[PDB]
Amino acid sequence: MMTEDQKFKYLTKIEELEAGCFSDWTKEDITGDLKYLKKGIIEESIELIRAVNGLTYSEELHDFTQEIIEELDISPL
């Protein structure tokens, strides 16, 4: 189900895309209501499932670009 490959691209995503661009480079298409599901693809911890049953709970995903989307962006691909 995609993911796992582009997850290392998160390195530079948190670098540049932290600006809040609607060219948000978090995988393709919306999985969550506001696409914000796509962040839990890498660390997939169950405690994060509390947020949308898919994404970060915003406790640990920061180094993996969580606050870039965090329900602020709604841009699919």
Side-chain angles (χ1 to χ4, degrees):
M1 299 176 60
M2 62 176 66
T3 74
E4 296 178 74
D5 181 70
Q6 302 286 88
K7 71 173 183 66
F8 189 76
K9 180 255 288 295
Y10 287 17
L11 213 172
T12 55
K13 174 189 173 59
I14 225 300
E15 293 291 83
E16 303 306 289
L17 223 291
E18 194 185 24
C21 310
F22 68 98
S23 302
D24 169 77
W25 312 101
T26 323
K27 299 308 164 288
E28 186 177 281
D29 187 29
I30 64 176
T31 37
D33 182 54
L34 300 182
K35 86 162 295 188
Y36 58 110
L37 191 153
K38 295 290 187 180
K39 292 93 63 48
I41 61 93
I42 168 172
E43 298 298 277
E44 51 175 88
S45 312
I46 291 302
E47 295 179 70
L48 322 175
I49 268 51
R50 304 301 299 185
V52 85
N53 182 31
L55 89 157
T56 187
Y57 153 80
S58 297
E59 66 173 296
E60 56 173 303
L61 266 295
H62 188 138
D63 289 276
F64 308 107
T65 67
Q66 86 197 330
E67 40 286 288
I68 288 71
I69 306 75
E70 66 161 85
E71 298 179 85
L72 293 176
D73 181 76
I74 314 84
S75 310
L77 295 176

